[PDB]
Design a protein around this motif. Structure first.
Motif, mmCIF file in Angstrom:
data_model
loop_
_atom_site.group_PDB
_atom_site.id
_atom_site.type_symbol
_atom_site.label_atom_id
_atom_site.label_comp_id
_atom_site.label_asym_id
_atom_site.label_seq_id
_atom_site.Cartn_x
_atom_site.Cartn_y
_atom_site.Cartn_z
ATOM 1 N N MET C 47 -10.335 -13.301 16.160
ATOM 2 C CA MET C 47 -10.139 -13.854 14.826
ATOM 3 C C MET C 47 -11.453 -13.866 14.061
ATOM 4 O O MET C 47 -11.474 -13.650 12.845
ATOM 5 N N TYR C 48 -12.560 -14.131 14.759
ATOM 6 C CA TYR C 48 -13.868 -14.042 14.119
ATOM 7 C C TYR C 48 -14.131 -12.630 13.626
ATOM 8 O O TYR C 48 -14.699 -12.438 12.550
ATOM 9 N N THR C 50 -11.992 -10.404 12.671
ATOM 10 C CA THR C 50 -11.203 -10.257 11.445
ATOM 11 C C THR C 50 -11.870 -10.959 10.259
ATOM 12 O O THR C 50 -12.050 -10.368 9.185
ATOM 13 N N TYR C 51 -12.234 -12.230 10.450
ATOM 14 C CA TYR C 51 -12.871 -13.038 9.410
ATOM 15 C C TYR C 51 -14.166 -12.405 8.911
ATOM 16 O O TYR C 51 -14.424 -12.371 7.702
ATOM 17 N N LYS C 52 -15.000 -11.916 9.826
ATOM 18 C CA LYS C 52 -16.281 -11.333 9.449
ATOM 19 C C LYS C 52 -16.078 -10.040 8.671
ATOM 20 O O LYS C 52 -16.776 -9.791 7.681
ATOM 21 N N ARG C 54 -13.388 -9.109 6.873
ATOM 22 C CA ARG C 54 -12.743 -9.326 5.575
ATOM 23 C C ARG C 54 -13.684 -9.929 4.532
ATOM 24 O O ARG C 54 -13.521 -9.668 3.335
ATOM 25 N N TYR C 55 -14.665 -10.722 4.952
ATOM 26 C CA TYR C 55 -15.596 -11.388 4.043
ATOM 27 C C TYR C 55 -17.047 -10.920 4.166
ATOM 28 O O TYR C 55 -17.977 -11.722 4.058
ATOM 29 N N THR C 56 -17.274 -9.629 4.390
ATOM 30 C CA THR C 56 -18.650 -9.135 4.472
ATOM 31 C C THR C 56 -19.005 -8.277 3.260
ATOM 32 O O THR C 56 -18.394 -7.236 3.022
ATOM 33 N N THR C 58 -17.400 -12.570 -2.675
ATOM 34 C CA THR C 58 -18.017 -13.211 -1.513
ATOM 35 C C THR C 58 -17.551 -14.644 -1.296
ATOM 36 O O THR C 58 -18.242 -15.353 -0.547
ATOM 37 N N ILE C 60 -16.438 -16.646 0.668
ATOM 38 C CA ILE C 60 -16.178 -16.684 2.106
ATOM 39 C C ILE C 60 -15.594 -18.041 2.476
ATOM 40 O O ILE C 60 -16.224 -19.078 2.219
ATOM 41 N N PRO C 61 -14.405 -18.087 3.057
ATOM 42 C CA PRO C 61 -13.800 -19.368 3.418
ATOM 43 C C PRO C 61 -14.397 -19.883 4.719
ATOM 44 O O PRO C 61 -15.176 -19.208 5.393
ATOM 45 N N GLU C 62 -14.018 -21.108 5.062
ATOM 46 C CA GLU C 62 -14.492 -21.700 6.301
ATOM 47 C C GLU C 62 -13.809 -21.050 7.498
ATOM 48 O O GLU C 62 -12.648 -20.636 7.436
ATOM 49 N N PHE C 63 -14.552 -20.964 8.598
ATOM 50 C CA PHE C 63 -14.015 -20.487 9.866
ATOM 51 C C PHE C 63 -13.953 -21.659 10.829
ATOM 52 O O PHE C 63 -14.986 -22.071 11.378
#
Lengths: 11, 154, 82, 103
Positions: C47-48, C50-52, C54-56, C58, C60-63
């Motif tokens: 999941m990290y 994916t998160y990294k 998608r938001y690289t 800006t 950026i939501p909380e993980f």
């Protein structure tokens, strides 16, 4: 951030 | 130890992931225009007398608050603010106010990241929220040293 | 296109190769067996990824990380260099 | 976009798809990964079997509910021989007890 170090050293 | 403290402070600030460097006042306002209340970043100050500025969304729009550094202590702008707490660490200052609005003063909530933090750093942040007793954790020495390097919750 | 990452307990996680390359460890070394990382951790690692990616925008939501896995997640993150 | 975990037994697929895409298109993705045709797959949201023709939005997979950091689980069952296997997903491992200091 050497730029900020030198700004403080100046002022 | 004055210059040594500012150097340590700037190492931490580079480690935050929410330092935007040479971002202009207009760029900061444009970035925060539609952000939620409490969203903040730190950037360089464009004013000769000041080193850094906090840009934060208030209910009335993005605003800028300069940070003073005098006598080896960081504090919010004393021209705008007047029992003003002082701090060796500017990330500590931010953390202080962040915690202060989890109780009840300066309303800071969520930082605006420049890019995605590393997973290691997010885990460090999470652990800092749970305990300060890093040494008592069932972790190898190398990871305790890593935790020791950044003790803040934001 | 895709790679398979197998946890210590034998769960198989199939993730986009691009996403998996977030880990420098995986990047250096189409299956990978970690034997020392359990599935409740490896899944959150994925999941990290994916998160990294998608938001690289800006914004950026909380993980979010549950306190109950945080120590193990840290070790996994350190092992994976991500 | 909607971010999904497709789960069967001890397999979990991380993938993304448009909210507007259908169940069938997701089965085609599964077919590309796991090498089983669409007509040998059943996908579920909890116990609810999902119809090939329905869109993801009508099934309840929203961009608010299925984020990169918190994907929604889609269950998967195959057609073993004639019938379908029961939907089975093996749980992930359990975290240990928190240290006291993390109180």
């Amino acid at each position: 951030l050497q730029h900020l170090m030198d700004k403080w050293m100046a002022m | 130890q004055q210059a040594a403290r500012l150097a340590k402070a700037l190492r931490e600030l580079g480690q935050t992931g929410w330092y935007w460097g040479s971002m202009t006042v207009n760029e900061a306002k444009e970035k925060l225009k539609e952000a939620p209340e409490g969203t903040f970043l730190i950037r360089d100050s464009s004013h000769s007398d000041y080193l850094l500025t906090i840009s934060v969304k208030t209910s009335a729009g993005p605003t800028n608050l300069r940070i003073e550094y005098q006598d080896g202590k960081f504090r919010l702008d004393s021209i705008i603010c007047v029992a003003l707490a002082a701090f060796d660490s500017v990330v500590h200052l931010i953390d202080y106010y962040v915690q202060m609005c989890k109780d009840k003063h300066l309303y800071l909530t969520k930082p605006l990241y420049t890019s995605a933090p590393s997973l290691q750093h997010l885990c460090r942040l999470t652990i800092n929220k749970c305990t300060g007793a890093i040494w008592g954790l069932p972790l190898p020495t190398r990871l305790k040293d890593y935790l020791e390097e950044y003790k803040f919750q934001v | 296109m895709y790679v398979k990452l197998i946890s210590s307990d034998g769960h198989e996680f199939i993730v986009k190769r691009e996403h998996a390359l977030t880990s420098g460890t995986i990047k250096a070394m189409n299956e990978v067996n970690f034997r020392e990382i359990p599935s409740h951790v490896l899944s959150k690692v994925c999941m990290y990824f994916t998160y990294k990616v998608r938001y690289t925008s800006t914004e950026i939501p909380e993980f979010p990380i549950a306190p109950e896995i945080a120590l193990e997640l840290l070790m996994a993150a350190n092992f994976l260099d991500c | 976009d909607v971010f999904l975990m497709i789960r069967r037994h001890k397999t979990t697929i991380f993938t993304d798809a448009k909210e507007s895409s259908t169940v069938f298109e997701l089965k085609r993705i599964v077919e590309g990964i796991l090498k089983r045709p669409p007509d040998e797959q059943r996908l579920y949201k909890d116990d609810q079997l999902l119809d090939d023709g329905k869109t993801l939005g009508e099934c309840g997979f929203t961009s608010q509910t299925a984020r990169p950091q918190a994907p929604a689980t889609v269950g998967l069952a195959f057609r073993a021989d004639d019938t379908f296997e029961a939907l089975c997903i093996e749980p992930f491992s359990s975290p240990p007890e928190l240290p006291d200091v993390m109180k």
